[PDB]
Design a binder for this molecule. Structure first.
Ligand SMILES: OC[C@H]1O[C@H](O[C@@H]2[C@H](O)[C@@H](O)O[C@H](CO)[C@H]2O)[C@@H](O)[C@@H](O)[C@@H]1O
Ligand SMILES: OC[C@H]1O[C@H](O[C@@H]2[C@H](O)[C@@H](O)O[C@H](CO)[C@H]2O)[C@@H](O)[C@@H](O)[C@@H]1O
Ligand SMILES: OC[C@H]1O[C@H](O[C@@H]2[C@H](O)[C@@H](O)O[C@H](CO)[C@H]2O)[C@@H](O)[C@@H](O)[C@@H]1O
Ligand SMILES: [Ca+2]
Ligand SMILES: [Ca+2]
Ligand SMILES: [Ca+2]
Ligand SMILES: [Ca+2]
Ligand SMILES: [Ca+2]
Ligand SMILES: [Ca+2]
Ligand SMILES: [Ca+2]
Ligand SMILES: [Ca+2]
Ligand SMILES: [Ca+2]
Ligand SMILES: [Cl-]
Ligand SMILES: [Cl-]
Ligand SMILES: [Cl-]
Lengths: 149, 149, 149
């Protein structure tokens, strides 16, 4: 009896795990995730980079990072307003790196940017037309997270 | 070994619990939930107050209640059209109360409202410009639910 | 110990099942699901019919099929642009059938359609009028999946 009950429960667990994964798939789809593409999403809340990072991490994602022009446009249409990207030049000034590791491949800087103005600007925001502007990490911008393809 | 399988099952259940909690958090975030703020959702369906209550209750939420101007604006944006609020004077005519209990504090009544017109109006709808009007609970208005912060 | 823990885990599993059902209801409501009505969802991606069937199949739904004018309008509004319907005449030219099986009840063909132009047209797209046109299954149109009422 006990070995049988346990086996049956193990089967119920497998089914439940698959059903949750399905729920996750349907949700991503409803929010616009394209086949074979990363899922970008926002709650339209503006906050400092430290909070965006903590927030996306809490949902098991990361701050949105455009790896090419196509993902840049995707993040642009999701954000609507100015949003932080998971890129900073905190280690060596001018050397932008992804918060998940590695040197910057694709970039879409605005005219006269990055300019590290004032006391300094080590974070990055995607703004109007999808162009980039380095900004203070302490400034508040829209939180956009990315989840794997 | 029975005991080893039971321990694995405890681990599988805990993992499931944590992933479902994550699914709930990601969904709220995608629906616009701001940090430390309750969030609002609607399917844009219009129905009598009693139905809205049942529906929200069934989702472990409650008909939306504006506790301040920010929340009121947020509800207004989600709704898009006239929607019921979790406020009524059903228990004692003239004394509006929250469906979850307590006398109404913050309010945003249109001029000359509430007016309990006709045979009476004991429900409340957020309408044009986000102002409020008491209306018959039997009329159909947009169902908007609120969930905890 | 053994038996008590097993009984607890059974209640844990049942509790999880109820919670996930709850999450699915909340998600459906946010996706726009109207009471007792089937609902349509899209990620706004355009792709060939085969990829639409595959994508909807993964999510345990089916390619959208309008059964009457009301459902046909619902699909139109969700898609916004041309979208494939779960209808084709791939089996027998001239004879449209549902992908779920069966001959065509409701139809909303644009004048002179279906015409199987040029090399051939075995799929159907609901256009920007709500009307239908048979088109190549290899063409890319918006993916709209359907879930039960
Ligand atoms: O110091 C912040 C930022 O200021 C300047 O850019 C302006 C801002 O991004 C914002 O206020 O919008 C303006 C356009 O409406 C934009 O010019 C630049 O000096 C920039 O380099 C700097 O990071
Ligand atoms: O905004 C005024 C009032 O409008 C609607 O009710 C109407 C009025 O009470 C009045 O003019 O009589 C009409 C029927 O003869 C009635 O429709 C409602 O929206 C009401 O709640 C509102 O206060
Ligand atoms: O609305 C008619 C027809 O339009 C589109 O196809 C075009 C026509 O078949 C025709 O004029 O020739 C064109 C190629 O030279 C062709 O694109 C399609 O929407 C078709 O399905 C429709 O029947
Ligand atoms: Ca620096
Ligand atoms: Ca810098
Ligand atoms: Ca700058
Ligand atoms: Ca009364
Ligand atoms: Ca009254
Ligand atoms: Ca009134
Ligand atoms: Ca054919
Ligand atoms: Ca054909
Ligand atoms: Ca045609
Ligand atoms: Cl900075
Ligand atoms: Cl009433
Ligand atoms: Cl074809």
């Amino acid at each position: 009896a006990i070995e049988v009950k346990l086996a049956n429960m193990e089967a119920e667990i497998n089914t439940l795990k698959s059903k949750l994964e399905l729920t996750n798939k349907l949700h991503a789809f409803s929010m616009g995730k394209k086949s074979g593409k990363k899922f970008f999403v926002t709650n339209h809340e503006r906050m400092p980079f430290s909070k965006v990072k903590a927030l996306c991490s809490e949902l098991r994602g990361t701050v949105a990072i455009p790896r090419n022009a196509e993902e840049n446009k995707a993040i642009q249409e999701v954000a609507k307003t100015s949003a932080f990207l998971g890129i900073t030049d905190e280690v060596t000034e001018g050397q932008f790196m992804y918060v998940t590791g590695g040197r910057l491949t694709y970039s879409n800087w605005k005219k006269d940017e990055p300019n590290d103005v004032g006391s300094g600007e080590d974070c990055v925001t995607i703004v109007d037309n999808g162009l980039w502007n380095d900004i203070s990490c302490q400034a508040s911008h829209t939180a956009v997270c990315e989840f794997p393809a």
